[PDB]
């Protein structure tokens, strides 16, 4: 049951936009809402509006009086001397709650005229006509206007609606909540050479009487929220999908072949999401818009998605096809379960984020294989256990503070830190995988189909929300639908992993009792760390003995420590028979390293990742080597690679080398075995016999049979030896001699890989392989032996580093004339120059990176150069570079770059709270408090980034470096 | 390619990793584009 927090119900909204002026960056328009009051004596009506100048408001064609105030413009007063962050977080939460449409509130308060009170008490319709104007928007609509001359379509100027969550208040007045569903009528009067893309279906396109402008009329009969309404106006090249004909793809001019190749896969994503769920795609059209200077890499609205143009690749670009493919896939998953089925509160957001991430993981499983699915699930689980042990924990479904261990309030999406938002979505889809583990996948897809079917029977009624609230899901409704389809309720699993905000830590060690033939496990939990919680459920453990692989369920109550499980025979060591594996197959194992008295070959605690856990198991090194070689699970091979770094014995070198030589191993395991072999080789110097590690293996796999030092000409058509070939010198460059310097046998090998590179014969580009070659050249740089702080000049350069510097100079200059796909070699060469500057080789001068961080460059070059400037101002304690970065945060045209500068200055801070630094003035505290209070008031993501930066630099209490 | 890059760095605006370093390791100076996605994303040999 859904009861509105608003005293009115909104039925229909007309959004008309005229006069989109690109020179002056200005729009004019009106908005006409059709509300039905649910309570009599409505009097004031409270709507949401930011940055719009409200000209006039007429209610039922009668002139009404409005008052506007935004408390989130300046959160705390300018003349308050408070400088602690808990004060700002409480004031910011109160300010966002005072404009919240999820309460009754709002920023624009319109007073109902007196003569309509007899129209409002007996509950009859009210039609509110606001007309507004955005004079030069700092948020919401982003105007990308290039400085080439010509007409606005000839130079490539466009507008798009940017922002996250409820940010539609930034470009027209609305009820900007996900729970106020209404039908829509959208008119946009644009230039005759431009096209206006929006939500709904385009009913017509009429000309103006001078035929210089045309009006696009859109209609949206599926009741969506105001937060799902978008806009993209530009000189877009239109491409109808040749497979599905209601799907149109819009790109920027001159990028039509890239659009043709890139969006050619999307019909398979549509077919997948419509056959695992049994509902068809709910909207009547689908539109993909590719734009410049995007807010996020992929945004999903109702019947529309806005991607950045940096996803567009051609047919000869690999290492970008899977990333763009999965961006399209998660946009479509959010089309199904973020835009059609919406949110009932700010709680129950974990339901939608979990269903979107879970069905996108099912797509990844079918498309890229079960092994890529397991690797992705393991990397997401490692991400969340790192974040939750780092700071507190992520609390899905809080109850309204519920989480007081962290420096922001979790009551609203616009007060969350961006890393918390990312980990929120990550934990939501892993908890949905856990619900699939308890209640099987076919019942899970039946739950999702029941939600979609209730929403689509709801979506066709005309009753104003008598039935339109069946399109809003809640937690209680989701659990009730689960209990309807399965008969089991998941309330212990919901109580543990949703309502409780923690992950578990397992420390395991075994001992084999030879007398009674049992395996005595010893599993203890660390439940006193700040991020942890105590697990009391069951726990699966998989033991591989000589007779095969056996699963055991252990009951781990609070007082439990020793778990005795039984062991089988050892009669497959009496005769040589094959040892049967986890799957149905069996292999020949070399049992010379195994103990004579124990049959068990390896043990895995929680193999299926059925809890949110971090396992620290103490096996013997031969058990880790057997688990690396003969396991049929990629997460166990990865964890054995990760645990073999502590055992540098030559049997582990043989194990990793046999993994590296082995095709029919998953390629991301061999790419990890490269770096593990490099670390082991560095640890057993003065024992290593022959050549450096992986060199003979590289010449055996990727070089000519007649010439060992000449590499084969590039043929990248295998896509697994391409990735292994481009990752093996990067790990090989981490080799070090007894003198702690990279050997001149590996550096010469990398330089010969660079010289003899011929790419005139493959059908794929070479930009990522050459960029990884520059990364391998950067890995070999050891710190220089400066004497008496000698100035680093050209004559006293290292003889090794002069070759590296010549190569990166040649590569960067050749990129200036023949550019790569996304300037990958510019990014790699800037990263390598920063590596050479971090050691004492090149003079520590930020002027090159400051010239590459200007506005007109590509955004990857910009963020690489700004990363180099952030690293410089951390190491050299530069005041003027920090003022340069803070000025670039305040006034840069691209808001993604501002968010990225705040992000990089949070990750690599110039000082922490423990450090005494020269950059701990009252002036810097006043600048960052002014940046939290004012200055970042237009983005909701810059303000949370400024809160994160103030927390990283000065902590939760009063800045110490202050009177 | 070395001859081409030295010729293009000598007859234009130049940068340098070292102080006043034009003879050895000359860098072609970074110029901003008005539309950078066109020179980034588009293929040149097709």
């Amino acid at each position: 049951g859904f009861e509105s927090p608003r005293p009115y119900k909104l039925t229909h909204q007309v959004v008309c936009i005229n006069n989109i002026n690109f020179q002056r960056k200005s729009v004019v328009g009106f908005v006409e809402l059709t509300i039905f009051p649910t309570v009599a004596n409505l009097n004031r009506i409270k709507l949401n509006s930011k940055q719009c100048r409200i000209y006039r408001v007429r209610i039922n064609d009668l002139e009404a009086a409005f008052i506007y105030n935004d408390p989130t413009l300046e959160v705390c007063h300018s003349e308050s001397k408070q400088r602690n962050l808990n004060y700002f977080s409480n004031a910011y939460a109160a300010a966002v709650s005072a404009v919240d449409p999820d309460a009754g509130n709002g920023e624009l308060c319109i007073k109902v005229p007196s003569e309509l009170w007899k129209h409002v008490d007996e509950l009859k319709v009210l039609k509110i006509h606001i007309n507004f104007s955005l004079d030069q928007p700092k948020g919401g609509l982003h105007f990308v206007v290039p400085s080439v001359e010509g007409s606005m379509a000839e130079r490539g100027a466009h507008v798009f609606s940017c922002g996250y969550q409820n940010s539609t208040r930034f470009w027209f007045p609305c009820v900007d909540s996900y729970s106020e569903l209404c039908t829509w009528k959208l008119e946009f009067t644009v230039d005759a050479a431009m096209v206006a893309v929006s939500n709904g279906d385009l009913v017509e396109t009429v000309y103006t009487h001078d035929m210089r402008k045309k009006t696009f009329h859109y209609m949206l009969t599926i009741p969506t929220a105001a937060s799902n309404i978008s806009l993209a106006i530009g000189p877009f090249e239109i491409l109808v999908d040749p497979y599905m004909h209601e799907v149109t793809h819009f790109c920027l001019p001159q990028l039509l072949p890239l659009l043709k190749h890139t969006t050619s896969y999307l019909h398979e994503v549509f077919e997948f999401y419509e056959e695992i769920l049994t509902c068809r795609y709910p909207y009547s059209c689908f539109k993909t818009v590719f734009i410049d200077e995007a807010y996020v890499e992929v945004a999903a609205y109702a019947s529309m998605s806005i991607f950045s143009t940096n996803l567009l690749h051609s047919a000869m670009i690999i290492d970008e096809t899977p990333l763009t493919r999965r961006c399209l896939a998660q946009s479509l998953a959010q089309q199904f379960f973020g835009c059609f089925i919406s949110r009932m509160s700010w709680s129950d957001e974990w339901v939608l984020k979990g269903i979107s991430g879970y069905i996108y993981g099912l797509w990844m499983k079918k498309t890229f294989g079960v092994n890529e699915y397991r690797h992705w699930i393991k990397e997401e689980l490692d991400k969340i256990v790192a974040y939750e042990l780092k700071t507190g924990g992520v609390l899905l479904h809080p109850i309204f503070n519920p989480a007081s261990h962290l420096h922001f309030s979790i009551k609203h999406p616009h007060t969350l830190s961006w890393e918390y938002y990312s980990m929120f979505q990550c934990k939501a889809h892993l908890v949905m995988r856990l619900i699939e583990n308890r209640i099987s996948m076919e019942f899970m897809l039946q739950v999702f189909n029941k939600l979609l079917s209730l929403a689509s029977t709801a979506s066709s009624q005309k009753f104003q929300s008598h039935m339109w609230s069946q399109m809003l899901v809640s937690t209680s409704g989701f659990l009730k639908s689960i209990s309807n389809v399965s008969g089991k309720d998941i309330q212990p699993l919901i109580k543990q992993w949703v309502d409780q905000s923690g992950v578990v830590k397992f420390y395991g060690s075994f001992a084999f009792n030879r007398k009674r033939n049992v395996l005595e496990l010893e599993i203890k939990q660390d439940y006193t760390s700040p991020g942890t919680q105590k697990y009391v459920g069951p726990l699966k453990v998989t033991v591989q003995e000589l007779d095969g692989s056996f699963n055991h369920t252990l009951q781990i109550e609070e007082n439990s420590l020793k778990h005795d499980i039984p062991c089988h025979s050892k009669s497959r060591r009496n005769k040589k028979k094959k040892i049967p594996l986890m799957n149905g197959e069996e292999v020949d194992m070399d049992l010379s390293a195994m103990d004579a008295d124990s049959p068990l070959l390896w043990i895995r605690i929680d193999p299926d990742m059925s809890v949110l856990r971090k396992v620290e198991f103490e096996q013997a090194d031969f058990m880790w080597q057997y688990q690396l070689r003969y396991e049929r699970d990629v997460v166990a091979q990865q964890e054995s690679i990760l645990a073999l770094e502590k055992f540098p014995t030559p049997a582990s070198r043989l194990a990793l080398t046999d993994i590296l030589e082995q095709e029919q191993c998953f390629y991301r395991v061999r790419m990890s075995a490269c770096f593990c072999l490099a670390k082991i080789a560095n640890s057993m110097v003065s024992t290593w016999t022959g050549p450096p590690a992986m060199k003979s293996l590289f010449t055996r796999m990727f070089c000519c049979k007649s010439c060992p030092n000449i590499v084969k000409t590039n043929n990248f058509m295998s896509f697994q030896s391409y990735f292994l070939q481009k990752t093996m010198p990067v790990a090989m460059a981490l080799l070090r001699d007894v003198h702690n310097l990279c050997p001149k046998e590996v550096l010469t090998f990398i330089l010969d890989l660079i010289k003899y590179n011929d790419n005139r014969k493959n059908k794929f580009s070479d930009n990522y392989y050459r960029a990884e070659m520059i990364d391998a050249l950067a890995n070999s740089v050891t710190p220089a032996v400066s004497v008496n702080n000698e100035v680093r000049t050209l004559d006293n350069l290292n003889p090794d580093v002069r070759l590296i510097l010549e190569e990166i100079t040649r590569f960067l200059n050749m990129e200036k004339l023949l550019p790569s796909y996304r300037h990958t070699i510019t990014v790699s060469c800037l990263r390598a120059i920063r590596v050479l500057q971090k050691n004492g080789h090149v003079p520590s001068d930020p002027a090159l990176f400051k010239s590459y961080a200007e506005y007109g460059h590509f955004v990857d070059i910009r963020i690489a150069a700004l990363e180099a400037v952030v690293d410089y101002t951390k190491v050299d304690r530069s005041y003027e570079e920090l003022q340069w970065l803070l000025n670039m945060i305040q006034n840069d045209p691209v808001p993604y770059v501002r968010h990225k500068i705040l992000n990089m200055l949070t990750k690599n801070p110039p000082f922490t709270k423990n450090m005494e630094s020269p950059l701990c003035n009252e002036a810097l505290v006043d600048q960052l408090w002014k940046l939290m209070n004012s200055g970042t008031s237009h983005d909701w993501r810059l303000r949370c980034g400024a809160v994160d930066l103030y927390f990283t630099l000065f902590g939760l209490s009063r800045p110490s470096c202050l009177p | 390619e070395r001859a081409l890059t030295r010729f293009m760095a000598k007859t234009g605006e130049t940068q340098s990793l070292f102080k006043d370093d034009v003879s050895t390791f000359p860098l072609i100076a970074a110029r901003p584009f008005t539309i950078p996605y066109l020179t980034a994303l588009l293929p040149s040999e097709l």
Binding site: R760, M814, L818 | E1, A3, L4, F7, M8, S44
Partner: peptide, 13 residues
């Protein structure tokens, strides 16, 4: 027989 793009650009400049 046909100059590579590097030396084609060098010839042009």
């Amino acid at each position: 027989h046909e100059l590579s793009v590097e030396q084609q650009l060098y010839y042009k400049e």
